Amino acid sequence: GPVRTPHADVLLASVGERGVLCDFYDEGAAADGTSEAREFATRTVSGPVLELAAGMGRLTFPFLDLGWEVTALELSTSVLAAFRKRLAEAPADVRDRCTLVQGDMSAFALDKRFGTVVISSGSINELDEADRRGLYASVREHLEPGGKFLLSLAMSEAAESEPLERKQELPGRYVLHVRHLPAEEIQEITIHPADETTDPFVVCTHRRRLLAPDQVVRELVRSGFDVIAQTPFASGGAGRKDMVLVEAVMP
Amino acid sequence: GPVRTPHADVLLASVGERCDFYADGTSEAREFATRTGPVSGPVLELAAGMGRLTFPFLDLGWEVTALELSTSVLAAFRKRLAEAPADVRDRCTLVQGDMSAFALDKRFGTVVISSGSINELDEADRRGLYASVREHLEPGGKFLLSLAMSEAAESEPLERKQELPGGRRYVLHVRHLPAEEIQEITIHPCTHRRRLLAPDQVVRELVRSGFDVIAQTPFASGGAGRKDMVLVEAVMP
Ligand SMILES: Nc1ncnc2c1ncn2[C@@H]1O[C@H](CSCC[C@H](N)C(=O)O)[C@@H](O)[C@H]1O
């Protein structure tokens, strides 16, 4: 069914149903990022912008609020429908710089090039390694000359750190430097009410892919982009910096 | 063209003017034999290199089809086989092949692969491996893998709490399960990156594609000291 996490295991045992184990995407009770959008803006606008897997407009609207023309591309027709509902209930000027398009960000093709192409950490992490290559290839084909590819990328503690070195003393028949660089983790969340009474006690688990920023960056280089900047920021305006803003251009 | 690490460039100028980078299988093979039993019927070792484990396996008396991709490496292996005595040599059948896609039309009691071999495939190819391996297992037959386990892979992931409102108050728990790291080397008076899967990540992948993983046994590769490897047992339901 849902993912049975270790903390959830204990809770659900302790609470005896009453408690219910759920994935974080079914029911139910269960988006604001103007600080992330702002991070994207800082790091650019000449022309129109393409947002990939724009979901429901979490960033797309903030972008439109800054006067930008946005082609928002989404795969889910249902999310697409919901986006178009929000879009319907907003000022015709706001409405008219926005273009929705169904599409697969791993293999998409528009009758249009673009000065700026943006993708949020949430989205890039939906793709495996193969599709990620598809994305890079695709994007390259949609950048006007000199245009930037801007990516936000969540940064785990392990990816934030300077990987631990281990020097050695191995003679031949030298000094050896090993590093274990992070490439990909699984972010696992568990959310439950602070009580235990409540009734019902719904326990929310989710597992998702979480790529190391440096990893994406290597992928990017390997695929013909140059990464001209990488900038840590906190997603909620202040706190620990838990995100990296990456700029890529075609050489 | 060769990978330019941080420690390289801080030695590349911190020297002036005066390249990429391209062990004993006894303990390791024994660990495989521990989780094998009988053995009735022959064994198939995928990506056998040049016999580092194969020769151990033969000394356990086993019958081994050793699959390897490389024409050059097969040349080495064949010569080594030729210097072995004849009962060793006659229990070893070499085959050029691709561990990610191969038919051999025969099935095997046991199927075996080494950490270095599986770490050489990306995700898609590993999907193919498990599919192949399946196609080549006799029922009840065991699929054994050894997997390097780094310090990241073995540690209990650190957990972060945090209280949040609505207006209902919630508790939020976040763990980071390791899955893939990069092994980066700098040899030194010389460079190499490489894949290093988390044994757990491989296990998840085995389940995702058919097998029930019946055992995960940590062992030292050297055959002494800290257990730096994991022997995984898989079978087809
Ligand atoms: N292959 C694909 N092609 C296009 N969109 C995809 C996709 N796979 C997943 N998605 C979409 O990517 C979104 C990920 S969540 C990101 C939403 C938004 N950019 C934000 O910042 O909140 C989801 O809306 C999902 O429908």
Q: Tokens 């791993």: give the residue.
A: A106
Resolution (A): 3.0
Topology given in CATH for the domain delimited by B24-149+198-237: Rossmann fold (3.40.50)
* A192 touches B: beta carbon within 8 Å: yes
d(CA B163, CA B155): 25
d(CA A173, CA A177): 19
Structure tokens at B69: 């991709």
Instruction: Please report the DSSP string for B163-219 in residue order.
Output: EE-----EEEEEEEEEEEEEEEEE----EE--EEE-HHHHHHHHHTTT-EEEEEEEE
Backbone angles phi, psi at A157, to 5 degrees: -45, -55
Q: Ligand 1 pocket check: which of A98, A123, A131 to mutate, most ligand atoms within 8 Å of Cβ?
A: A123
Q: How far is CA B113 from the centre of its chain?
A: 6
Q: Tokens 């700029």: give the residue.
A: A247
> How long is chain B?
237
Closest CA to B2 of B167, B161, B139, B192: B192
- Which H or E run contains B76? helix B71-83
C-alpha dihedral sign at B115, B117, B120, B123: negative
- CATH class of the domain comprising A1-30+156-211: alpha beta
Structure tokens at B27: 């303990």
Q: Pairing mode, if any, of strands A114-119 and A226-233?
A: unpaired
Selecting from A174, A176, A192 the residue whose C-beta is nearest the C-beta of B171 gives A192
Structure tokens at A77: 């027709």
Integer angstrom CA distances of residue A229 from A40, A50, A141, A239: 12, 20, 21, 22
- HEC letters along B103-164: CCCCCEEEEEECHHHHCCCCHHHHHHHHHHHHHCEEEEEEEEEEEECCHHHHCCCCEECCEE
Selecting from A175, A179, A191 the residue whose C-beta is nearest the C-beta of B188 gives A175
Structure tokens at B178: 């390791």
A57 lines ligand 1 (CB under 6 A): no
Closest CA to B235 of B145, B148, B153, B147: B145
Q: Do B183 and A180 meet the contact criterion of CB atoms below 8 Å apart?
A: yes
d(CA A79, CA B144): 44
CATH architecture of B1-23+150-197: Other non-globular (6.20)
* Residue B148 CB coordination number (10 Å): 20
What ranges do the domains of chain B cover? 1-23+150-197, 24-149+198-237
In this structure, the dihedral spanned by the alpha carbons of residues A29, A243, A237 and A150, taken in order and rounded to 10 degrees, is -100
Topology given in CATH for the domain delimited by A31-155+212-251: Rossmann fold (3.40.50)
